């Protein structure tokens, strides 16, 4: 009927604000510390937690996340740690999605991973290197286990591919990226009413406020990793600032 994240964006619209979507990679600086950090995100005001699966060759990630996931892998992080992190977030009262490259899912098994993500309490999957053209098995698994499917659109996306990508998404659309970020959101808003999350290297409360003026969600990741590296108290403070920034709308 409705997307798993539907009610979350509904509660944010009623409060005249954007959702705060925070990303952290599993296993950095270790598995127990990362879960304590993700719990702190729920406590510090994150509406949605993106739980990242560390991957050996993360071509789409910047240096901050790429080096943290690399350190996580040096520590022996496993994919099952991500499912254990989703369960801890759900128990703490948070709303967790998983962000992963596609080969770890293929290796696990798309259906088996969807089933196990659903059973852990996960609400959706973000697939930065899976386009709808290859998403046949994922679409079936997304519907069977009632999981949202968050694809990415790009500023360079052709109008035909933007439409097909938006049509294939459930929950929200990840507008990955000047003036290109509002324009990309507008191109999505022209063909659908699905929520639009925006990632834009957000570091400050003001940046979250700016994006909240046109986006349904504000995605922060690299800055959260940087804060956790300084320490868990630094992550709490920054997440609070960003939580206030999304209410500026």
């Amino acid at each position: 009927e409705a997307s798993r994240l539907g009610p979350v964006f509904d509660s944010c619209r009623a409060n005249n604000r954007a959702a705060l979507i925070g990303y952290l990679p599993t296993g950095y600086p270790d598995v127990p510390a990362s879960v304590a950090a993700m719990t702190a995100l729920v406590e510090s005001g994150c509406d949605i937690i993106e739980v990242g699966v560390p991957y050996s060759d993360p071509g789409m990630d910047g240096p901050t996340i790429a080096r943290a996931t690399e350190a996580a892998l040096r520590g022996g992080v496993r994919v099952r740690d991500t499912l254990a992190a989703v369960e801890a977030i759900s128990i703490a009262g948070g709303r967790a999605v998983v962000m992963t490259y596609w080969n770890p899912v293929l290796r696990y098994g798309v259906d088996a991973f969807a089933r196990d993500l659903a059973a852990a309490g996960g609400l959706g999957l973000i697939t930065p290197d899976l386009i709808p053209d290859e998403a046949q098995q994922w679409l079936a698994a997304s519907e069977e286990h009632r999981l949202d499917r968050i694809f990415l659109v790009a500023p360079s996306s052709t109008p035909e591919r933007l439409a097909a990508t938006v049509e294939a998404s459930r929950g929200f659309v990840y507008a990955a990226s000047s003036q290109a970020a509002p324009e990309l959101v507008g191109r999505v808003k022209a063909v659908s009413d699905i929520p639009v999350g925006v990632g834009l290297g957000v570091r400050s409360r003001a940046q979250a406020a700016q994006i909240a003026q046109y986006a349904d969600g504000v995605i922060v990741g690299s800055a959260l990793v940087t804060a956790l590296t300084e320490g868990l108290p630094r992550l709490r403070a920054l997440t609070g600032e960003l939580a206030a920034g999304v209410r500026l709308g």
Partner: protein, 404 residues
Amino acid sequence: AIAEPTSHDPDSGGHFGGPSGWGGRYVPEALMAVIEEVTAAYQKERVSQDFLDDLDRLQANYAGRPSPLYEATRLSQHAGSARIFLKREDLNHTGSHKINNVLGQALLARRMGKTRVIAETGAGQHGVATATACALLGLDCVIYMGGIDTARQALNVARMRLLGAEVVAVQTGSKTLKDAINEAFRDWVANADNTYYCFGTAAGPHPFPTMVRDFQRIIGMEARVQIQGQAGRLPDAVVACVGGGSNAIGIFHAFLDDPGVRLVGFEAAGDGVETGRHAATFTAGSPGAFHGSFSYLLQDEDGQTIESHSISAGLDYPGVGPEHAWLKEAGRVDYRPITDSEAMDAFGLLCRMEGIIPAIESAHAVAGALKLGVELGRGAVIVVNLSGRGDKDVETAAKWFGLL
């Protein structure tokens, strides 16, 4: 012969074998606009007579095609008295098969109005060929190369720089071919609107596996004509080394529909397939999505890429092209491992018997051809793709044989 397609082509999405799903485009949406742009440009220019005329003119007068086919009679005693024929791609301009693919893609890059060409390189032969065509056509060029490969293939680094191409050393990961591909990928994502990615092997997302193979098909088409003219029949076997798969698919393709012709690809086994220091993708890998395609790769139980190891820079890659994964599933091609020691022995043997210094990549094929000659016996005709010459490997080989 690029104007006419083949019965072995993938669907519009780049999938081989229907339900098996080999190939495809496992890429971010951020690359799909340029990926569709290259695909459309290639379908337009492959039937354009002006394009075909430019490519043929360069292959003949610039690259030196056709390359000859040479019966290495002094190897026969070391190959069970079989008859080893060397397809002499080592004699192409720049010294390997890579120039075939690069001339096609470089001409395409100019047709698309791209102002900048990037490429990865492992052995440095694709890097030199790319630098070569960008000098010739007047295009900005940047080559990404793993830091370990810049050290063991230093001759080709200096060739690239003399040719006016920028060379970026890649220090991430295993500092070899797969890491160069990662870095060049990131460049393409950021600069797609004006940058052409001249990919050097028969892998990646559609259209690269098919386009690279189409530009390399000239090898096997020549070889099929040359072997019949010299030997009076089709070969019993055609063999090649397999890194990503471009020189192998290039010489295999013309023989796919010849049922009596055995096709054998030889992949790098490094220190041995049981040591965890190898690059034997088919022997020890499994299916997965990697570098834009669904194919085989060396991966652990969670799907993390396992780093490869080989004395040969050009085969030191944990993946393989999707058309090969399809051909292996169909049973049309067999893929076998060849170790560092086997390759180096064949290297020295080819030096002393035939006066040919091969690339260490190509020495894996010679090594496997020697074993296949013993298997097939006296009088068997075996065509071997001698993919490159070994000037880049002379230091490594002299150190291996104590000649310093």
